[PDB]
């Protein structure tokens, strides 16, 4: 009944069996769990926060100079209330790290993001193995399924944003389930603003400090033949706090072939991960014959 | 073997049967035909041209003032070669004409577009009836199928554009078939730059003056159970000329139910026109369960 | 020492002289004053609020559908935290009201904005007359100076926005003085977030309900030969509240000739209002000879 | 009377004096000259062309995939005539080369741009010395004036563009003089489309192959106390050809102090180059007191 909050270090000790049973239960009945004692140092997370926030502040300062100047163009005084406070960019890590070639980051920043990205990779694969165990599969199974030819895709979206101006503005807002593998979310403050649908109703992720919030995608549901369902959610920015998010995605390689583990077995489909995303981006129906085939299906 | 060029007025005379046989043949074996003597006055088309071109010239003059000024911002001299010469906007006509409320047109312009849009509607419905006849269907059949509840959607895209900088830039460019009903294309100059794929190869639409180029969409293929195929094409702007296009679309109403005429009967599907477009815009797979169903299909 | 809060209705009564003396004092020593009892009904302001907020909510709902869909394009899940919550548009009123032809407002909205704009015009001209009186000028003087040929320019910027994500983000943010005539600001809630520089330090506009905040521009400083200085300010969106602003500007007509009243007399310049703005938009130096003349000046 | 076309290699020979006299005459009476035999190999220019064109073609292919996909979003078929064929980016070279960190260039491309940028720098400084000589100044004088503290700013704008859709669209288009030092323009084909105003009328730059077109900016006019005037021009893309431009700018360092050479001496002003550009970008009047000072000047 309570949202799973899990002290990962307990898997090294006498409490392991009960921690694995929480992980199992979250996987089966929540789709989500919040990790503490997960092995990424407080100091590293605090540095990632500070520096991301430093870069945000800079791009905001620059962005106001530019608003003032374009607005002057149209014979218009730009106010600070005209600001767009949302800023988001990505960083690839696997198979090829583009961290070196993304515009406008300090070197000291890129190296911090590098290290942090290696740490979370390592954490992800550990999590996948513990899922394997609970699941009766072999160590490495999911990392292997996710491998494809060149490897799993892994990146981190880095967001900075203001609070929602009022909750009823979210009233009518569609949620989703994530299409990929396993997602690890790192935020600032105490309140995420992250919510999951459970039995028709919205449950808040409980505020923690130095936590990582883990959730399973569509792909893990297929490989488990539905045993672990990817779950609907949303994330709304609270006046309370959490103005920054790092959402890192450990997804199957583009060419990877996804399908329910034979041991774990209606039957979920088999398919190449990239075709799941091409369905997703709307690039599987820009021809006529596909389209006619789909309307015959409905 | 020759692209169909059809003098529509001949349907009023002793030559009708041979003109209907061209229309039939184009419908079956070209998907396209070029109309002359189609009953829209030379004077009306020439006014539509002039005025569209007048409005283009204005939005270009304005657009250079703004480029000069934003470029100055970044300590940069804007050249005329920095110009974006492409300009396109739409006009609705049916079920509700938004021609009155589109920004930045002269009144004298809106009224010309109104009249012109009534004329082409009338021409479209005539064309659909002549298709009915060739097809063995009743007068009004297609207009009726297209009606839905509120009526057929009808609008005109108005484009102005420079020439392609070089043909091999189009080399690797995907074509398409139109998703809607029947399309009537009005251009300037002599060379369209419009091409259709016929038996694997690119055929140019032959240059004519005061012509209208007609082509059938995906919807007419379904209602004819494949007898009239919608055909692949593209349109590339020629150094030769044709720098302006008015493409008017007479499509089924959103809620209209499309399906192969029982008389005209594998079997094509039945479906609501709006679901064909939602497939098209990529809004039918932004949930997980649809997506899993589609991968099981492949 | 206290920010001027002025009950306008008191100019109809035994307290007039003391209210005029507040207006005089604010004009001379604050540049700003907050009006209550100003003669625009509570019901009208409350309707303007509600309806603006209704339109905001709609454009936000629509804006999230579009973010979800474009983000899907790039194989990316749009979150609600990716939202851009800032929305701003204008409405002209004088010399020609474009309220009828601005995209996407209910009719019931346009009529409310019309009425409201007539009311504030009337309030502005009253304020200018009371300035005349305090100043020793004739009734109508400033309205007349502002008239030019076709009339004074009058419009309203309508803004909706989230809170600033954190105050130190404003830390390093340039303020300004308004370039025009007289500005009347209508907000929601209680806290504006509006601040004025007075003797080197930031003073908050005091929270009021159904207030209008008035401030004088650069133009009124010139006509008063510096007696009424236009004052520096800024406006920052508070977590506390005030998520909406209507800032209406009563400025001199484009062709109006601005210059210190002979009675009110270094000497401020004389000039056409439009040249002050062209200086402002950076369109007075896009040629070489101007530029050389300015560097010789410095 | 004829546009100056100058074989630079002749400065190494018996013809030097007559070539220097052409350079002198162009500097005094044309502001522009076209260089051939200028010492940048045919092979290097041809490689720069090919590779720029290869990169253009790629960004165009990518840009059409994205248009098709966003247009589908709005239930709209993207045509090739909807294309925006204009593409432009910059490359810094001095004081710090950002060529390594600009997005989406082949390595083999960056190295070609590096070399090419060193070659043109070397050519620029040579040209400045020959100007010194004609002028009676010492070798290095202008390079030294341009040096400031960190060095001269040097970069190259790289443009690719379609033809102007029709000449009367340029009819009403403002020209300019360049604000910087000395500009070297490298194009493809034969016809630039570049024109200079000379005695009130438009003169075309004569078509040449493997030419470089040189022109003097506002800064060189000041240092020569008007002896060498920077001249008005424009560049329009011809159906004839020249679809690519590399415009490289050798300007004074930001902090450089520009002023008429004492030997060369109304008197032109003295000033820091960056203040000339800040005048230019419209950032010298975003405060009130500047503005009042300027209106008193007029
Ligand atoms: Fe998500
Ligand atoms: Fe088409
Ligand atoms: Fe202001
Ligand atoms: Fe130029």
Write the DSSP string, chain C. -PPPEEEGGGGGSTTHHHHHHHHHHHHHHTSEEEEES-SS-HHHHHHHHHHHHHHHHHHHHHHHHHHHHHHHHTT-PPPGGG----EEEEEEEESS--GGGSTT--HHHHHHHHHHHHHHHHHHHHHHHHHHHHHTPPTTHHHHHTTTTT--EEEEEEEE----S-GGGTTT---B--SSSEEEEEESSS---EEEEETTEEEEPPP-SS-EEEEE-HHHHHHTTTSS----EEE---SSS--EEEEEEEE--TT-EE---GGG--PPP-EEHHHHHHHHTT-S-SSHHHHHHHHHH-
The answer to whether the CB of C291 falls within 8 A of the CB of D218 is: yes
Can you name the residues that pair with A252 across neighbouring β-strands? none
- CA D37 → CA D8, D12, D19, D188, D247, distances in Å? 5, 11, 12, 16, 19
Residues of chain A neighbouring D283 (CB-CB closer than 8 A) = 69
Instruction: Say how many Å lie between the CA of residue A234 and the centre of ligand 1.
Output: 6
CA distance D109 to B294: 43
CA distance B88 to D102: 31
Burial class from Cβ neighbours inside 10 Å (0-12, 13-18, 19+) for residue A36 reads: middle
In total, chain C counts a number of residues equal to 298
Residues of chain C neighbouring A161 (CB-CB closer than 8 A) = 81-83, 165
Cβ contact A72–D281 (<8 Å) = no
Which of D101, D103, D282 is the closest to A72 by Cβ? D282
Instruction: Say how many Å lie between the CA of residue C259 and the centre of ligand 2.
Output: 60
Minimum CA–CA partner of A100 in chain D = D101
Minimum CA–CA partner of A72 in chain D = D286
CA distance B143 to C288: 64
Backbone phi and psi for residue C125, each to the nearest 5 degrees, phi listed first = -85, -30
Residues of chain B neighbouring A285 (CB-CB closer than 8 A) = 279-280, 282
Residues of chain D neighbouring C221 (CB-CB closer than 8 A) = 288
Instruction: Say how many Å lie between the CA of residue A75 and the centre of ligand 4.
Output: 26
Which of C276, C292, C296 is the closest to D291 by Cβ? C276
In total, chain A counts a number of residues equal to 298
Task: Tell me how close the Cα of C45 comes to any Cα of chain B, in angstroms.
Answer: 28
Sheet with A182-187, edge to edge strand ranges: A5-7, A32-36, A212-216, A182-187, A244-251, A153-160, A87-94
Which of D72, D103, D282 is the closest to A69 by Cβ? D282
Other Cβ atoms less than 10 A from the Cβ of C57: the count is 17
Give residue B37's region: left, alpha or beta (phi > 0; psi -120 to 50).
left
CA distance D83 to D85: 6
- Tell me, rounded to whole angstroms, the distance of Cα C108 from its chain centroid: 24
The answer to whether the CB of C56 falls within 8 A of the CB of C105 is: no
Instruction: Say how many Å lie between the CA of residue D81 and the centre of ligand 2.
Output: 11
Cβ contact C72–B101 (<8 Å) = no
Q: For the range B18-26, what are the long-range contacts, defined as Cβ-Cβ under 8 Å and sequence gap of 24 or more?
A: B20/B130, B20/B133, B20/B134, B23/B130, B23/B131, B23/B134, B24/B134
Cβ contact B69–C103 (<8 Å) = no
Q: Do β-strands B5-7 and B32-36 pair in parallel, antiparallel, or remain unpaired?
A: parallel
* Residue written as token pair 């004389």: C270
The two three-digit tokens of residue D260, written as one number: 């008429």
Residue closest to D179 by CA, chosen among D88, D87, D281, D27: D281
Instruction: Say how many Å lie between the CA of residue C271 and the centre of ligand 3.
Output: 22
Element (H, E) at B115: helix B107-135
Sheet with D244-251, edge to edge strand ranges: D5-7, D32-36, D212-216, D182-187, D244-251, D153-160, D87-94
CA distance B188 to B50: 10
| DSSP assignment letter at B266 | -
Known binding residue D210? Answer is no
The two three-digit tokens of residue C33, written as one number: 């004053």
The answer to whether the CB of D201 falls within 8 A of the CB of D191 is: no
Minimum CA–CA partner of B161 in chain D = D81
Q: Within the 43-62 window of chain C, which residues sit less than 8 Å (CB to CB) from chain A? A: 57, 60-61
For residue D288, the ligand closest to its alpha carbon is 3
Element (H, E) at A215: strand A212-216
The answer to whether the CB of A215 falls within 8 A of the CB of A179 is: no
In total, chain D counts a number of residues equal to 298
Burial class from Cβ neighbours inside 10 Å (0-12, 13-18, 19+) for residue C183 reads: buried
Tell me the count of B-D CB pairs closer than 8 A: 126
Give residue A37's region: left, alpha or beta (phi > 0; psi -120 to 50).
left
Coil/strand/helix, residue B221:
helix
Whether chain A has a CB inside 8 Å of the CB on D68: the answer is: yes
Which of B69, B282, B286 is the closest to C282 by Cβ? B69
| DSSP assignment letter at B83 | -
Cα dihedral A68, C191, C116, C252 in deg (nearest 10): -40
Cβ contact C281–B72 (<8 Å) = no
- Tell me, rounded to whole angstroms, the distance of Cα A33 from its chain centroid: 13
Q: Do β-strands D32-36 and D5-7 pair in parallel, antiparallel, or remain unpaired?
A: parallel
CATH number assigned to the domain comprising residue C13: 2.60.120.330
Element (H, E) at A233: strand A233-235
Cβ contact D72–A101 (<8 Å) = no
Which of A279, A286, A295 is the closest to B271 by Cβ? A295
> Looking at chain B, which subunits does it touch, using at least 3 CB pairs closer than 8 Å as the criterion?
A, C, D
Whether chain D has a CB inside 8 Å of the CB on A262: the answer is: no
Instruction: Say how many Å lie between the CA of residue C177 and the centre of ligand 3.
Output: 6
- CA D10 → CA D6, D16, D23, D137, distances in Å? 9, 6, 12, 21
For residue C194, the ligand closest to its alpha carbon is 3
For residue C68, the ligand closest to its alpha carbon is 1
Backbone phi and psi for residue C22, each to the nearest 5 degrees, phi listed first = -65, -50
Cα dihedral B116, B119, B120, B124 in deg (nearest 10): 170
Element (H, E) at D69: helix D42-73
D263-291 in b/e form (b: 16+ CB < 10 A) is eeeeebbebbbbbbbebbbbbbbbebeeb
Other Cβ atoms less than 10 A from the Cβ of D112: the count is 19
Number of domain units in chain C: 1
Alpha helices in chain A (DSSP H): 16-29, 42-73, 107-135, 141-145, 218-223, 273-280, 288-297
Cβ contact A286–B174 (<8 Å) = yes
* Residue written as token pair 């082509």: B215
What was the experiment behind these coordinates?
A: X-ray
Q: Which residue in B110, B283, B285 has the most chain C C-beta atoms within 10 A of its own C-beta, making it the best mutation to test that interface?
A: B283
Cβ contact C286–D69 (<8 Å) = no
CA distance D111 to D108: 6
For ion ligand 4, residues whose CB falls within 5 Å: B 77; D 178
Known binding residue D178? Answer is yes
Backbone phi and psi for residue C124, each to the nearest 5 degrees, phi listed first = -50, -40
Instruction: Say how many Å lie between the CA of residue A237 and the centre of ligand 1.
Output: 14
A69 Cβ neighbours under 8 A, 6+ residues apart: B73, D281, D282, D283, D286
Whether chain B has a CB inside 8 Å of the CB on C101: the answer is: yes
CA distance A243 to A52: 11
B120-134 in b/e form (b: 16+ CB < 10 A) is bbebbbebbbbbbbb
Coil/strand/helix, residue A53:
helix
Residues of chain D neighbouring B66 (CB-CB closer than 8 A) = none
B104 Cβ neighbours under 8 A, 6+ residues apart: B55, B59
Element (H, E) at D141: helix D141-145
| DSSP assignment letter at A170 | T
CA distance B99 to C252: 34
Task: Tell me how close the Cα of D63 comes to any Cα of chain B, in angstroms.
Answer: 11
The answer to whether the CB of A25 falls within 8 A of the CB of A5 is: no
The answer to whether the CB of C88 falls within 8 A of the CB of C282 is: no
Whether chain D has a CB inside 8 Å of the CB on B218: the answer is: no
Can you name the residues that pair with C157 across neighbouring β-strands? C90, C247
Burial class from Cβ neighbours inside 10 Å (0-12, 13-18, 19+) for residue A62 reads: exposed
Cβ contact D269–C69 (<8 Å) = no
Residue A231 domain boundaries? 1-297
> Looking at chain D, which subunits does it touch, using at least 3 CB pairs closer than 8 Å as the criterion?
A, B, C
Instruction: Say how many Å lie between the CA of residue C131 and the centre of ligand 3.
Output: 20
Cβ contact A161–C281 (<8 Å) = no
Instruction: Say how many Å lie between the CA of residue B194 and the centre of ligand 2.
Output: 9
Instruction: Say how many Å lie between the CA of residue D3 and the centre of ligand 4.
Output: 17
Coil/strand/helix, residue B194:
strand
Other Cβ atoms less than 10 A from the Cβ of B105: the count is 18
CA distance C218 to D292: 9
Backbone phi and psi for residue A86, each to the nearest 5 degrees, phi listed first = -80, 135
CA distance B255 to B272: 6
User: Rounded to the nearest 10 degrees, what angle do helices D288-297 and C273-280 cross at?
Assistant: 130
The answer to whether the CB of B233 falls within 8 A of the CB of B196 is: yes
CA angle (C227, C233, C239) in 5-degree steps: 150
The two three-digit tokens of residue C295, written as one number: 């560097």
CA angle (B219, B224, B228) in 5-degree steps: 80
């Amino acid at each position: 009944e309570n949202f799973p909050i899990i002290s990962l270090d307990k898997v090294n000790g006498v409490e392991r069996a009960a921690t694995m049973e929480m992980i199992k239960d979250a996987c089966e009945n929540w789709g989500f769990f919040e990790l503490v004692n997960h092995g990424i140092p407080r100091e590293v997370m605090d540095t990632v926060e500070k520096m991301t926030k430093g870069h945000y502040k800079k791009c905001m300062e620059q962005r106001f100079k530019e608003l003032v100047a374009s607005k002057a163009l149209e014979g218009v005084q730009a106010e600070v209330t005209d600001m767009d406070w949302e800023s988001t960019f990505f960083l690839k890590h696997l198979p090829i790290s583009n961290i070196s070639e993304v515009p406008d980051l300090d070197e000291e920043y890129r190296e911090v993001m590098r290290d942090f990205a290696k740490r979370l990779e390592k954490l992800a694969e550990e999590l996948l193995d513990l899922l394997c165990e609970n699941l009766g599969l072999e160590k490495g199974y999911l990392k292997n399924a996710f491998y494809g030819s060149k490897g799993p895709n892994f990146g981190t979206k880095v967001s900075n944003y203001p609070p929602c101006p009022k909750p009823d503005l979210i009233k009518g807002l569609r949620a989703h389930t994530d299409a990929g593998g396993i997602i690890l979310l790192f935020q600032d403050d105490k309140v995420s603003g992250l919510q999951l649908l459970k039995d028709g109703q919205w449950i808040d992720v409980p505020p923690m400090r130095h936590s990582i919030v883990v959730n399973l995608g569509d792909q893990l549901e297929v490989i488990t033949n539905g045993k672990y369902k990817s779950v609907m959610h949303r994330v709304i920015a609270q006046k309370d706090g959490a103005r920054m998010s790092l959402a890192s995605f450990y997804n199957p390689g583009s060419d990877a072939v996804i399908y329910p583990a034979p041991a774990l077995v209606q039957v979920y489909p088999k398919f190449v991960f990239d075709d799941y995303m091409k369905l997703y981006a709307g690039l599987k129906f820009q021809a006529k014959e596909p389209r006619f085939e789909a309307m015959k299906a409905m």
